[PDB]
């Protein structure tokens, strides 16, 4: 009745008065969604005092631009979030940034705004949900019951990606899974006649979602109430609510494009105060009996998760070893030593393909580390499949899996696979979770990928066939710009590992990352055992492997082009050249060491030639000269791609030759000194 | 009848016996598609000893991983590829790649493999052919009337790109585009069961498809062919055939994911032969009944090629403007002294962002250059919109423009766009397309990016709110790393224009491109015009803007970061420095020019400091010295954020000092010079 819409108003006109300070922003879904957010929150259990509290129902603005709602919320509810950082929206500093940011904003569980992101972030939340809920619950011990409830607009339904997870979310039977499309006939680009004239909840239903429809979602918060009422009835599918609203509701502009992107008029803002009650000369008014209304919804949810907290002592009694492992998830760490699993090789072990190694150590420490889950997209499973012993994330009802399971099919889904990444390190309780694909196609998510980046999520990458290496599929398949793109990308750790010891130093990082995505950069063809490599120096991110005290050159490479460094090495001994080598494994990881360690390994007073089979970019950062393959590849078997581009012995210890030439008579320091 | 049975056991057995020569390579679909190739090539006008003509029928092989089967059929037709061509299938060098390159394969419209490209391709050869009829078509001059043939399997179904284009391609109404679907319920991550159980069909006449389903099309090419003719019937509506096939059909393993993507075994291949009346002991046989089978057509189409060169003639008598205009686009000639109608600007002149100079530019060469259409995607109308004069393409049916437009409304659709521009390249007729999205939001189409490179099309993005310079849609909005990302791509052009005259000279070199894609890297904020700047200097891609024959400094910039080093020369006097500034506008371009002229601009025997605020990657192959900006970036004022990253005059100058200081005592060489 009347605080409820006292409530709806004072969301409305916090989010216009938020975008009027700004001279900035979207007030058009804020106005229409107003209605949806105070009838959904009212519906989530969360504590505003506890952001991570594991059972919390999340929500999700997938139409992020439409962000002054989220933060009208988060202030209503008691979040560490106030009216004065609403008046700071798009300000430089605040807490109220113009699209929601996770590292930000308290209650923002992920980064959103580019279009799409979120309701795959969202798909996700829900399926780690699953698969924690089959890991820990027990009778009488609903540890994991909570929802998902994603809010998505018309340019969301365009992109392709969230087509990508809704289709494998209905595969998925993701029943918690709630969202609702704002039907407002609008997108950033325009009136949708123009462009999107499909017919949506047909497509939904193709892809075994339940379809609820509000018909007047403007006024009918009864209705989007029931509405998920519901979809919880409905277990086995993923429900997408049509809420069909007017864009900017209230506003003289309402329903038109011009409300989407730009500030209210003055005058409009004056005429909504005044027919909603409030006064028009006043801006960020908050009427004490809305937020005493949100407060007891506030109260009610403190005193679930209080018996929540009780619920969770019990089940630590009469599930002794669950419970622990349970605790320490929470908590943030990983199994003690788990680490002592990592394979470890010698040089007298034969000769294997990083992508094979890589997959050795998931089968080595995924029984040993319940937090890691991951799938693969777009890759035959003799490149990467389940580990032994474990199965298929899949509902039971298929006999294929069971939401027990480890593995996720993703299907040809890259880019959903990256943002549902996401999603799943978004839900919290440790998990280490990856996603295996070409190197090539991992650029197909690039939009993901960046948002991993930004999020600080400990996502991996598992990206096998790295280069030119992978051979006949030919120059479509094989990565030049892809290392260069994601090491320009800040918080990034882009893993090129050489041999055995340096895969296990990868997976260490990319395990134990809690901040910075990984992606692991691996070969079809084989790699022999290098002499000097371990996990302790290769965890460097950067280390000398053969060290030269009278080099002429030192040699810097990663992945297959280590060996090679390695052999050139013998060849330029014969030409009276002594080089070291280093292996550069993570660039992010080296550069993150001491000033004097990475000098030990880049000195000064000696030329530095780098060696990678794709872009020189970066690659300035550690050498004086590169040698690298700025031109697309070639449809052969790898050795004669190799061949005809001289990544052979014989051709680097030629550049090699040319570059301690080239350094003749001039004074040489590292690569590593700046003017600033 | 018979010969067309013996036809498609040639080409299955064709297929088959590339894959065991390269003993890499995919047999199943080849197999699974012979009875549809077979039936679609028969439908299809074409000419094998002129594959650029206008008006033929184009096929596009989505599923590009199965291009035994193209390189077969273009053989049997006599296309200038041969038996001993196939022989090479997957062999460095050969005219018959892993994945088939429009670059390198006669016949070959586009380049296909990364899934889902090619039915978005398709997409864009049917948009240019209604818009290209639309604009030449008179009363008994069917100038063009082709269709547009797609093969696609379940991996391309699953990538979202496909989905976007295939909305984008029931609202446009394109029934000139007739897409088959191999339903044989495998991709290359399994059986579809795993993780594709959506309902295509219902999701393709949720997209206004018509649909056709042949239920036994390993067999009955008369239901093939039946399709084909219903397709032609239904002008209003793209069609989706749904091909039910054995993948692998008549293999031992037929019905099977290890026939996707590996050789078969060779007793396989002899029972394959001995059960289609082939010889076992025999490779590559073509029955010389199949090729006069295949050659009839042929002539039948080279007299249909042979009366529209006279159509074509007779059109020229009765339209002789719009003949001669034809003419000179199928001549791959732009119009006389187009480039006049390109804007020039004074240092007189008002600051201008670079985002409405692209807009005025193209304001004036659209009406100019009828081969110029273009669009955009995620990008409100007052960001870009057509030119004035002219309307959106849309099916008159509509409304909302006609066939004849030159604007398209993507939608919120970015990576469709960018394979459907491919697509429009593709057609040929001299089209010069666009498309225009935040420079952020190209990364979402890099899987189309790259392919526009690969396959060296002329394709032009329009990349507005370039950096940090947008200000308050923040860092999930600020391009960081994507300038890099597509400078280490091969075959880019990567504009980043500071000025008016900047901007004409990025359009010229965009429009006169032949087989290099451009993006325009473009401001949403003012910039100054600048003294010194012209079309002519900035068509090199860099230039010498400020000479100072005594520098101290040289400081090389791009688009908003030349004004600021003009502004830091000044600062600098103050100093008692002396610097020059270079304009880099084109990277690639640059790199093109003369040795000399390089050295020109980046002399020998000066330090020299680049200023661009994203990554520094590439950079050094410019300068000594790189300020630029590695983090992501801030939700605020714009101006602010410079301020807080020191991109002001003040900042650029101590840099400058401390760069002089650097290289005092020291020999400096010019960042041109390379050992090897």
């Not at 032994?388 to 294929?400: C, E, I, M, R, S």
């Amino acid at each position: 009745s009347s605080v409820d819409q006292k409530a709806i108003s004072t969301i409305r006109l916090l989010a216009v008065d938020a975008v009027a300070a700004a001279n900035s922003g979207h007030p058009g879904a804020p106005l229409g969604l107003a209605p949806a957010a105070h009838a959904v929150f009212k519906k989530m259990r969360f504590n505003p005092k506890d952001t991570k509290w594991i059972n919390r129902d999340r929500f999700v603005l997938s139409n992020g631009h439409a962000c002054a709602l989220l933060y009208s919320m988060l202030v209503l509810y008691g979040y560490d979030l106030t009216v004065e950082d609403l008046k700071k929206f798009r300000q430089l500093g605040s807490k109220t940034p113009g699209h929601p940011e996770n590292t930000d904003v308290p209650g923002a569980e992920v980064t959103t705004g580019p279009l799409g992101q979120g309701i795959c972030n969202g798909v996700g939340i829900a399926l780690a949900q699953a698969q924690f809920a089959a890991t820990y619950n027990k009778p009488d011990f609903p540890i994991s019951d909570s929802y998902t409830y994603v809010f998505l607009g018309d340019g969301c339904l365009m992109e392709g990606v969230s087509s990508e997870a809704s289709s494998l979310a209905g595969h998925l039977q993701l029943g918690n899974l709630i969202a609702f499309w704002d039907d407002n006939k609008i997108s950033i680009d325009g009136s949708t006649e123009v462009a999107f004239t499909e017919d949506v909840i047909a497509r939904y239903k193709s892809y075994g979602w339940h379809i609820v429809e509000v018909s007047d979602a403007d006024t009918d918060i009864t209705a989007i109430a029931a509405a998920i009422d519901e979809a919880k009835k409905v277990t086995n599918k993923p429900t997408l609510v049509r809420l069909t609203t007017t864009i900017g509701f209230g506003s003289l502009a309402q329903g038109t494009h011009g409300v989407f992107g730009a500030p209210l008029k003055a005058d409009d803002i004056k005429q909504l105060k005044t027919k909603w009650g409030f006064n028009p000369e006043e801006s960020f008014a908050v009427p004490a009996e809305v937020t005493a209304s949100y407060n007891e919804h506030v109260a009610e949810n403190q005193k679930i998760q209080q018996q929540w907290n009780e619920l969770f002592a019990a089940y630590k009694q009469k599930y002794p070893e669950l419970g622990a492992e349970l605790q320490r998830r929470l908590d943030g760490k990983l199994p003690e030593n788990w680490d002592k699993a990592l394979p470890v090789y010698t040089p007298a072990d034969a000769a294997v393909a990083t992508r094979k190694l890589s997959e050795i150590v998931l089968s080595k420490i995924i029984p040993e580390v319940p937090e890691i889950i991951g799938g693969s997209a777009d890759l035959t499973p003799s490149n990467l499949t389940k580990a032994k012993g474990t199965v298929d994330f899949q509902p039971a009802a298929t006999g294929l899996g069971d939401y027990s399971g480890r593995y996720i099919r993703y299907g040809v889904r890259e880019h959903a696979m990256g943002a549902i990444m996401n999603g799943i390190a978004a839900f919290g309780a440790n998990y280490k979770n990856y996603g295996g694909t070409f190197l090539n196609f991992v650029s197909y998510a690039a939009g993901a990928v960046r948002l991993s980046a930004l999020s600080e999520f400990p996502i991996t990458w598992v990206a096998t066939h790295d280069s030119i290496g992978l051979g006949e599929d030919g120059p479509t398949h094989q990565p030049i710009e892809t290392l260069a793109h994601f090491r320009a990308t800040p918080n990034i750790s882009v893993w090129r590992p050489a041999d055995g010891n340096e895969t296990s130093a990868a997976y260490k990082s990319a395990i134990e990352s809690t901040h910075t995505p990984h992606i692991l950069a691996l070969t079809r063809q084989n790699l022999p055992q290098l002499e000097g490599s371990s996990i302790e120096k290769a965890s460097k991110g950067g280390y000398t492997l053969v060290q030269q005290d009278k080099a002429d050159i030192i040699i810097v490479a990663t992945g297959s082009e280590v060996s090679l460094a390695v052999d050139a090495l013998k060849v330029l001994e014969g030409q009276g050249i002594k080089a070291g080598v280093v292996s550069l494994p993570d660039q992010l990881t080296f550069d993150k060491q001491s000033e004097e360690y990475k000098l030990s390994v880049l000195p000064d007073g000696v030329p530095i030639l780098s060696v990678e089979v794709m872009s020189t970019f970066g690659w300035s950062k550690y050498s004086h000269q590169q040698f690298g393959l700025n031109r697309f590849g070639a449809s052969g078997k790898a050795p004669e791609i190799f061949k005809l581009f001289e990544f052979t012995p014989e051709g680097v210890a030629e550049r090699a030759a040319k570059t301690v030439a080239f350094y003749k008579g001039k004074d040489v320091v590292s690569p590593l000194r700046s003017a600033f």
